[PDB]
Amino acid sequence: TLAVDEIIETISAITPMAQKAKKYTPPAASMQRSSNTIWMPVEQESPTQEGWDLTDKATGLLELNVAVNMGEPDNDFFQLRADDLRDETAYRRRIQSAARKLANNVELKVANMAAEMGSLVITSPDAIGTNTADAWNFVADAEEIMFSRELNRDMGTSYFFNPQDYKKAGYDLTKRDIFGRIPEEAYRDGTIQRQVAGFDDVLRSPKLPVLTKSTATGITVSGAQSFKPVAWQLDNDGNKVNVDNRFATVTLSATTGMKRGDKISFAGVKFLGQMAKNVLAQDATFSVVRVVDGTHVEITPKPVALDDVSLSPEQRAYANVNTSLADAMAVNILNVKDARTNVFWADDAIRIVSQPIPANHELFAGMKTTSFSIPDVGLNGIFATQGDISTLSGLCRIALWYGVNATRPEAIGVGLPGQTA
């Protein structure tokens, strides 16, 4: 038998979301002490009154903030053996497979975080090939909701299709019985266009997660709840601890069947215009971030109500919903069928905090540590090797430390087609 070192190449992936997301590397010395979390302010909103005599009505100031932290390292620990001749040729390729696997894992984390924390939800009652220009309508709905909410889109916007719906869009384009330039491009290649319905980058991402249907039914808000913007609160010892602005814990009748990433919407509340505080016609949509306890959940866009009377004016300045929760309103579920998601966002809503692993120190003498660039994505990890006490063997560890943070869940979105039944 003759093995012949002629590699039968078999796989080839891509990491568009991870190579597109912004990356942040805060100072390691301060992030060690600050428990691997840092705080970033949010753009300020000003209350406004009109009149002539404004005595005793001078508002204060209030600036909210969000917290970005990090997860755990993703390693490729493996054991290298000399005196094998099969661990001599396999190791050289194991390093490369490790690099590709780590890049893919980073992209998977990015896609999952975006899909399970995208507040804006665009649901459709049928598939994409049902009507003509239906994929265009699907993208334009997302663009319209971003525009109406008046979210910051200076950095850019992006829409990610899955292969199924991208192919459906291309088929819709080619079926037109007319060939200009766009139909000919969608014929020769599968591309619809690089920009569709106003988005600055419309791609297809093969690793988009599937949002399974929610078996939560007959659920109502349990008691009136008012959520107030705040920037810190007093702890038991009298200290002031900052407060994350992108979460709100609601008390429901029963949180059975809910899970992380469920898209919900209360009956009666509507989106606002943020800046102008004009009531939209859309139902305000929220995303379940955590199922805490059995009658509480944690939804990501904090529902600051416009008509709340317990809100001081500088707090009411941040209102993004027309009406608060009314102690019996039905919480409708938006993901009623299993559907692989199409994900849109503003380009500055996901960041990938990164840290180093200082294994080049004098402390880690005896193990040889070098830098290791993860391809495609812009990340750097460590590659460390150390031999064994005897037996002519070794150990290799490829490590990478990062954390995927969604600083603007209200700017991340999700598209759910075929939401009938």
Binding site: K23, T25, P27, A28, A29, P356, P358, N360, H361, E362, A365, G366, K368, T369, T370, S371, F372, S373, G378, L379, N380, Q386, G387, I389, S390
Partner: protein, 541 residues
């Protein structure tokens, strides 16, 4: 898009691309400088004898001394069609700032590393001097780079020995704590923020550096078309000056002194940028530095590419196997000498019972006595006396020690002579000359010679900073390689003696002899001789 991400991507690509050659070179340096028993599992089990009987160090010393007996330096020669004296100013400046100990030591370190490991390098830098500057209150000096194989990392898309086609190069610095404080003081960095960078250590290297600091400098060369200005010299002619060199400093002082602008051209040229990086941050981003070429000059021994992979080799990499085998065989032979029972007789206890003090080693007796009879057998059995065999060296051990020594002797022959290594050092010196010339045109004040004297056309700005003005007739001389001289007077003396050695004894011999007395040093007797030569030449016309 991130600056640090791009820098680290390029650096990691270069590092992993050159991993193997650097590994072998580091093993060569360790083998030839620390110990030939380069294993790290030794400090785990038993001890056993491990002797080192070196046979490659004499060869390395011979090659080092051979390359040291013939010094080599730059020699600037005027281009064809240029003035016959177009290279004297540049040559004098080069000798003035290369006559110091740092330059010689840098070249010597690079040469020694070239012979032992396979690659060395050195660096050219510029600094500010107020006491004895070479020109423009600045100096250009040469600095060493120890362990170039692992401390200088070139762009992987390079196919030239001198690395003139590399687009970037990263140089790693390791310094003590006080040295880091001084480095931060010089580069306006934050000393408290300790920097960290790659510096992997071999498993076999048994020591700790401790309380050290690593940082990297990323040099990148960018070729682009930049705007250039055409003026008219208030003396004569039309000079060409770069827009970036007088963008605002003297862009109007040129006019005030009286330079009339004629045109404006776009000229393609190279600029060098340096960054200071660590594995987590970028400290200085794109500080522009003087010159057109990367200031790192590499020297190689046996150099080539095998499969798009660069391989370099010194003289040690091929003697290692035989030297290790010779060490092992001689250690085994030493063990045989030490731990082996010696030649002594074999006795039964009953044979010598009662005469045991006769055989201890004294000389108090004339003979040795043996017990003869036994009370049970009647007589003791007779068997010839046997002695423990003397220790011996096996024929396999002797044969392979001789064969290993012969193999090392046969493979440790550079050339027949160090001509190839000398030629590679000459190539490195030509690259050094190119880099020095570019840096000089960038920072020094080069006077231009006219056929009507030397003109140094410069001016001062409102901030009391004198900005050099260099015309585009700068590359008037090319680079060659000649003997190393400490000054122009020394070079002229050598040239006069060389001409004297070939001119027959006519009147030109008298002319050359009077010239040699002309260019002599200065006590009192040679002063009188020099004055006599002065008067004789002047009166002869």
């Amino acid at each position: 898009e991130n600056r640090l991400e791009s820098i680290l991507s390029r650096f990691d690509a270069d590092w992993t691309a050159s991993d193997e050659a650097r590994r072998e070179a580091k093993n060569d340096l360790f083998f030839s400088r620390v110990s030939q028993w380069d294993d790290w599992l030794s400090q785990y089990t038993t001890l056993q004898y491990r002797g080192q009987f070196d046979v490659v160090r004499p060869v390395v010393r011979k090659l080092v001394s051979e390359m040291r007996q013939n010094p080599i330096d730059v020699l600037y020669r005027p281009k064809d069609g240029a003035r016959p004296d177009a290279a004297d100013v540049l040559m004098g400046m080069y000798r003035t700032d290369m006559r110091h100990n740092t330059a010689k030591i840098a070249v010597n370190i690079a040469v020694r590393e070239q012979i032992e490991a396979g690659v060395g390098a050195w660096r050219l830098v510029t600094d500010y001097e107020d006491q004895s500057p070479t020109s423009n209150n600045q100096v250009i000096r040469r600095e060493p780079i120890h362990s170039a194989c692992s401390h200088v990392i070139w762009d992987s898309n390079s196919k030239l020995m001198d690395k003139s086609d590399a687009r970037h190069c990263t140089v790693i610095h390791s310094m003590s704590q006080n040295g880091w404080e001084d480095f931060a003081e010089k580069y306006d960095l934050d000393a408290d923020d300790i920097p960290s960078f790659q510096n992997p250590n071999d498993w076999v290297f048994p020591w700790l550096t401790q309380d050290t600091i690593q940082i990297a400098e990323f040099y990148e060369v960018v070729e682009k078309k930049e705007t250039a200005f055409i003026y008219q010299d208030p003396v004569t002619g039309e000079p060409v000056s770069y827009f970036k060199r007088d963008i605002k400093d003297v862009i109007d002082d040129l006019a005030d002194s009286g330079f009339i602008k004629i045109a404006e051209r776009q000229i393609k040229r190279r600029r060098v940028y340096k960054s200071i990086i660590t594995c987590t941050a970028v400290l200085k981003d794109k500080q522009l530095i003087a010159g057109e070429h990367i200031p790192i000059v590499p020297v190689f021994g046996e150099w080539g590419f095998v499969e798009d992979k660069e391989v370099y080799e010194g003289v040690v990499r091929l003697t290692k196997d035989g030297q290790r085998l010779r060490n092992m065989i001689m250690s085994f032979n030493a063990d045989i000498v030490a731990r082996t029972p010696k030649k002594k007789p074999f006795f039964w206890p009953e044979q010598i019972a009662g005469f045991e003090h006769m055989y201890d080693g004294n000389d108090d007796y004339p003979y040795y006595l043996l017990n003869r009879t036994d009370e049970n057998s009647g007589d003791l059995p007779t068997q010839p006396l046997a002695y423990y065999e003397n220790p011996e060296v096996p024929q396999a051990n002797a044969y392979m020690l001789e064969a290993a020594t012969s193999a090392v002797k046969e493979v440790a022959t550079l050339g027949v002579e160090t001509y190839v290594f000398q030629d590679n050092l000459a190539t490195a010196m030509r690259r050094d000359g190119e880099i020095y010339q570019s840096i000089v045109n960038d920072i020094y004040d080069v006077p231009r010679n006219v056929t009507i004297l030397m003109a140094e056309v410069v001016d001062l700005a409102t901030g009391e900073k004198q900005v050099l003005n260099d015309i585009r007739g700068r590359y008037e001389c090319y680079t060659d390689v000649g003997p190393s001289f400490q000054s122009m007077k020394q070079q002229n003396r050598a040239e006069i003696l060389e001409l004297l050695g070939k001119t027959p004894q006519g009147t030109p011999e008298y002319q050359l002899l009077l010239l040699q007395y002309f260019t002599l040093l200065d006590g009192k007797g040679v002063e009188m001789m020099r004055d006599y030569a002065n008067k004789q030449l002047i009166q002869m016309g």
